């Protein structure tokens, strides 16, 4: 099984990339369930730029063909306690995302699940032994509410609802 992303317009197969990282936002407020929720970043290109793990691919919430960590998944932030500061997530092993060309780009469900687990594990190092939950974007302008990227002189918009819907103890 794979995770498919509704894209618009339809990205050509040669626009398939390797996810080398992503950027998140920790949800504010409090919960009596001892859980920490993370969503796609509600920040700007500024948040993305300060991550400094991108290559030559202009993308929003997922880093395409960027820098990979040499040991383990590394997470960074200007301030872990400030929920207005995004969290930069650099992967150790890239995950293939293949575009069929008919409007969908598919990602391996197993590899992405394992990836989220490595992210959640590292997140537990910073926020303690709590339940890590990934939820879809809180919203925003088309470029940022979707996983958007440039390829071959064209800008595509891919919904990432199915990428961020997991719970990890």
């Amino acid at each position: 099984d794979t995770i498919t992303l509704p894209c618009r317009p339809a990205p050509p197969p040669h626009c398939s990339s390797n996810i080398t990282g992503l950027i998140l936002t920790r949800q504010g407020g409090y919960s009596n369930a001892n859980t920490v929720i993370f969503r796609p970043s509600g920040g700007d290109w500024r948040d993305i730029a300060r991550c400094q793990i991108a290559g030559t691919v202009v993308s929003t919430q997922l880093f395409l063909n960027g820098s990979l960590a040499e040991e383990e998944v590394v997470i960074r932030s200007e301030d872990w306690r400030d929920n207005a500061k995004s969290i930069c997530v650099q992967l150790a092993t890239s995950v293939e995302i293949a575009c069929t060309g008919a409007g969908h780009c598919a990602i391996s469900r197993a590899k992405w699940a394992n990836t989220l687990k490595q992210i959640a594990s590292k997140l537990r190092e910073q926020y303690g032994a709590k339940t890590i939950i990934f939820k879809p974007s809180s919203g925003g302008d088309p470029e940022f509410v979707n996983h958007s990227f440039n390829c071959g002189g064209e800008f595509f918009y891919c919904a990432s609802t199915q990428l961020f819907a997991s719970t990890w103890f």
Partner: antibody
Framework: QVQLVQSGAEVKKPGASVKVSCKAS????????MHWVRQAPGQGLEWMGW????????NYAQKFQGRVTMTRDTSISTAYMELSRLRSDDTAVYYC???????????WGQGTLVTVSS | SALTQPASVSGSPGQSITISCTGT????????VSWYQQHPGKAPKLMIY???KRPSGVSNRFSGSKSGNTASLTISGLQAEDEADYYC????????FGGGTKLTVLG
């Protein structure tokens, strides 16, 4: 001078929705996050969420996740706050505040009174 | 998180008064809270930010300090216009305001 001006007081029925606007002046609207804080009559201040004026991105408190929607109109430098499925305990004065950092809210709007009653 | 403030406090003109704000979470020494002044029927206003820093236009009478798990707002030259509600605010994790301390100036 830096100034935030909010819309007028409103009376509402439970189950309905309300949309408050916050007009910014004296500074570049996109330069700062906009936060929303409400205050029940005779009670304290309660944080609701912030919005990124450049990306439209938001982050609501889990207490209001699914009931609040925060938007903006950069053309008229206005931030909007909409709360749906209102209840009696949503009766409060709603403030908008310029982030200016972490918890360094300045300045605040004059506030908008939303009375929810059957 | 949760911040605890005294419900009210009293002071006579000219004297100094201190309002305390104690956190029940994991308390780090590493400039925690801000302070807000709110007159009745008015919006809150920033008096002290990042523990002790004071923004432009705010009188020197308002000073900020901290000891252990308790942050404190101290007003030196107490005047009648100081009569308002004072809230402490922390951003750690998620923005949380204190219960508020209703200061009364006994004139």
């Amino acid at each position: 001078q830096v100034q935030l001006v909010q819309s007028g007081a409103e009376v509402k029925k439970p189950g309905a929705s309300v949309k408050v606007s916050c007009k910014a002046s004296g500074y570049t609207f996109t330069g700062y996050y906009m936060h929303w804080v409400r205050q029940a009559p005779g009670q304290g201040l309660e944080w609701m969420g912030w919005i990124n004026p450049n990306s439209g991105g938001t982050n609501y408190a889990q207490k209001f996740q699914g009931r609040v929607t925060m938007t903006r109109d950069t053309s008229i430098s206005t931030a909007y706050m909409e709360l749906s499925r209102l209840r009696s305990d949503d009766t409060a004065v709603y403030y908008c505040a310029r982030s200016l950092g972490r918890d360094w809210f300045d300045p605040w709007g004059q506030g908008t009174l939303v009375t929810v009653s059957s | 998180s949760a911040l605890t403030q005294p419900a009210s406090v009293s002071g006579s003109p000219g004297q100094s008064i201190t309002i305390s704000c104690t956190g029940t979470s994991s308390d780090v020494g590493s400039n925690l809270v801000s302070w807000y002044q709110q007159h009745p029927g008015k919006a809150p206003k920033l008096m002290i930010y990042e523990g002790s820093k004071r923004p432009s236009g705010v009188s020197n009478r308002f000073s900020g300090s901290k000891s252990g798990n308790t942050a404190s707002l101290t007003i030196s030259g107490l005047q009648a216009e100081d009569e308002a509600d004072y809230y402490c605010c922390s951003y750690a994790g998620s923005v949380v305001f204190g219960g508020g301390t209703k200061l009364t100036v006994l004139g």
